[PDB]
Structures are given as structure tokens and as C-alpha cells.
Amino acid sequence: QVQLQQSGPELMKPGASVKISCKATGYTFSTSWIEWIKQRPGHGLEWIGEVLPGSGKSNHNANFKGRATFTADTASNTAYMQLSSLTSEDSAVYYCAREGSNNNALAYWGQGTLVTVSAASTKGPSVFPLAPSSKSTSGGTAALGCLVKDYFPEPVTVSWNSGALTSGVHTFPAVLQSSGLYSLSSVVTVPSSSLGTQTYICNVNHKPSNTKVDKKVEPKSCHHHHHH
């Protein structure tokens, strides 16, 4: 099973350098090139360069002006990309990828690493419950959620009940506010019948601020109409 495991998200100051890792398993490391791909919103996919582990050879997209350097530890089975003289232009998701076993298409991709370049300091989110609310006066279906508010930088992960609950889940794209901080919500719809006995917990991780929170979302104690 070919697998490429990348390092976590990073917040970097302008002018600094960042090094991203790509740990390979499932094949002979020295037999395939590792490709590096950059993705910014509304700008598709950009080829950065590539490294052939144990050969001393790498190729570079000239548009990076020598700022991207690649290495690979043959024994370790890990490839690395270093990007120097960082600016906001470098704020992007970066993937490593391996080409086909018998072909040149990018067959296997790492999960991606989000790098944010900013002068602003990291800020962890506050996680607020969105208590179940009924879809109609009749009852039957309830929406509940978590508000993940005022963090920097991206990304955050949100799951429900440790990944056990996925049906009906909507996690919204983050909104960048005038304050320079992000907020998002994650909601889920569930049967009204489940509210009395099923626990609903949103699991939130904001890696850059080392903030990891599990928030139980409880029904409100009181409402203003007769029970459904």
C-alpha cells in the first residue's frame, strides 16, 4: 500500500524558511521521483519541482527563483521541501506526490500541508455549542452544531463523536473577518427521537495554537411550546 504522510500545518513569519516532510511507505523509495505541488485558492495546481531519492538529482520550476530546495533521506524513506524568503505568495496547500508504478501521472498524493505566511500571531478558537433546534413546529428532525470562533491561521479539523457520526454533517468553509481572524461552524441534523439518549460531541483541533477541544452539545433545558 503506497502511502505518503506529510507534516502538519505551519504559521511562518515573512522572510523565514519552512521545511515540509513527506514520509513514504509501501515501495522502494529510490525507484520513484517525489513531486511537489502548490495549491492556492482560485489558482489551481502549480508544479514546484521534484526529487529522485539517492540520485542527487532534483528539478525546479524556475518561477520559484531558487527558493525551493528538495532533499530525500534514502534510508528514512522521507522527502523534504524547503521554501526560503517566505511571503504571503507562499501561503498555500503543498502536496507531495509519487508517479505511477508504470506511468508518469501523479498516482499517489500526500494529504497536503497548509502553510500560512503572516506577521500575525497564532490565536486559538473558542468552541461554542449550537443547541439542537427543530426543523418545524411538528418536530421530528433537529439541527445542532458547534461554532468554532476567532482563530488564526487556518486550518481547523472538526469531527463528530470521534468520527462515528458523518451522515448529515455540514462543516462550513471558514470566514475571514475584518479582525483578521477566522470562524466556522459545523452542524449536523439528527432524528428528534435521538436527543434524549444520544450524546453529541464535536471534536475540534486547531494545530497551530495547539488547541484541542471536545464539546458536548446538549439540548436546551426549556422551550416555549408544548413538547412535540
Binding site: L45, P129, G145, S185
Partner: protein, 209 residues
């Protein structure tokens, strides 16, 4: 250098329709690769060497072409096909096309609207966020407006919309109205009003603080 132009940039197709997206090269190229991406995940190898499906790709997908024109075809559009598709050729620069964003054209569906007052935990920190959820609607166009007592609100809310659902082809939208606790306490009725093609008249959800 050889440039790749994908057309159309955005397309919407009914379920079961045969859909073709094109990748045109400014000069002849000998093969084309295709990748599928859905928001929040890595691109996936989809079609390689022009016509070869990656393992797991449904048989409704096929690819072809030669020279200055290559294409990807779906013989019968499915909900799960809503995605962005990029063509790629190593002799082109940029090596990736800019992508075709494919949407599923389903029947009109009215939003289900929910409102959420601020949590006690938030209020204790000096802020009040009220959230309005518009769940599972189609098409994407929607108006959400906040109304506080007699007056429509402006500039104190932010909206976010999901990508099309891979199963039911709908969108959802969240609107969050944020006020200081002191401004929140000055008013009684908090309402969100929702207009959508699927509704015969506007829907208002509301609570008293």
C-alpha cells in the same frame, strides 16, 4: 510554451446526461492526464495516459483525444461526479489546466431554516453570535437577511456556503450575526428571513432574547 485551456470553466449537468469537458493545447501534445478534486481533499488520479481509468473510477468515465484537443466524458452524470477536474501534460507550462468545475443540475429544493441563539458560554465572554442555518437547498442562490426588532441589519453578519453535497446535490449556508453583549441586550426580537426560488413566500425564523 504549450498552454492548456480547459472549457467550459464551469458546467452544470442533469442526472443521467452525457457530459464532455475539453482540454485544448496551444500546440500539439501526445497525451493527457486527468485528476479529480473535491474541496478539502487532495487531487486524485482519475484518467491517465489519455484513456486509462485509475482503479475504482466508475466506467461511466472515459477519456480521449489527440494533438491540440483532449477530452473527458461522463456517459451518465451522477451526484458523486460533482467535482473539479484538471487536465495535465508534462510538456505544457503551466503543466496543469485551470480546471473545469462540474455541478449537478437537480430539481429545485427549498431550504430548511434553523436559528440558534448565543450560548451562555459565549455571552459570559462579552459577545453574542446568532446563527441562521439554511439546510439542503438547490439552486445556490439565496437571500438571508437579519432583522433585529423593526430593522433589517447590515454589515454585522457573514455567510458561508458548502460545496454541493455528493449524495443529494444540495447546498447549505450558515449566516452568523455577531454583536457585543451590550448591543445584544438592547434589543428583543432576533430574526432571520430567507428568500429562495423553492419557497412561495419568505421564511422567518425568530426568537426573543
Amino acid at each position: 510554451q504549450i498552454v492548456l485551456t480547459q472549457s467550459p470553466a464551469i458546467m452544470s449537468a442533469s442526472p443521467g446526461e452525457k457530459v464532455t469537458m475539453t482540454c485544448s493545447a496551444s500546440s500539439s501534445v501526445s497525451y493527457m492526464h486527468w485528476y479529480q478534486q473535491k474541496s478539502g481533499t487532495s487531487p486524485k488520479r482519475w484518467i491517465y495516459d489519455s484513456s486509462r481509468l485509475a482503479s475504482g473510477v466508475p466506467s461511466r468515465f472515459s477519456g480521449g483525444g489527440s494533438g491540440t484537443s483532449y477530452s473527458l466524458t461522463i456517459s451518465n452524470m451522477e451526484a458523486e461526479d460533482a467535482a473539479t477536474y484538471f487536465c495535465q501534460n508534462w510538456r505544457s507550462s503551466p503543466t496543469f489546466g485551470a480546471g473545469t468545475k462540474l455541478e449537478l443540475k437537480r430539481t429545485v429544493a427549498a431550504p430548511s431554516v434553523f436559528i440558534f441563539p448565543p450560548s451562555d458560554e459565549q455571552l459570559k465572554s462579552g459577545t453574542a453570535s446568532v446563527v441562521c442555518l439554511l439546510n439542503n437547498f438547490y439552486p445556490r442562490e439565496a437571500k438571508v437577511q437579519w432583522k433585529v426588532d423593526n430593522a433589517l441589519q447590515s454589515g454585522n453578519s457573514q455567510e458561508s456556503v458548502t460545496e454541493q453535497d455528493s449524495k443529494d446535490s444540495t447546498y447549505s449556508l450558515s449566516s452568523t450575526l455577531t454583536l457585543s453583549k451590550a448591543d445584544y441586550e438592547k434589543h428583543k426580537v432576533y430574526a432571520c428571513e430567507v428568500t429562495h426560488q423553492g419557497l412561495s413566500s419568505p421564511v422567518t425564523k425568530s426568537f426573543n432574547r
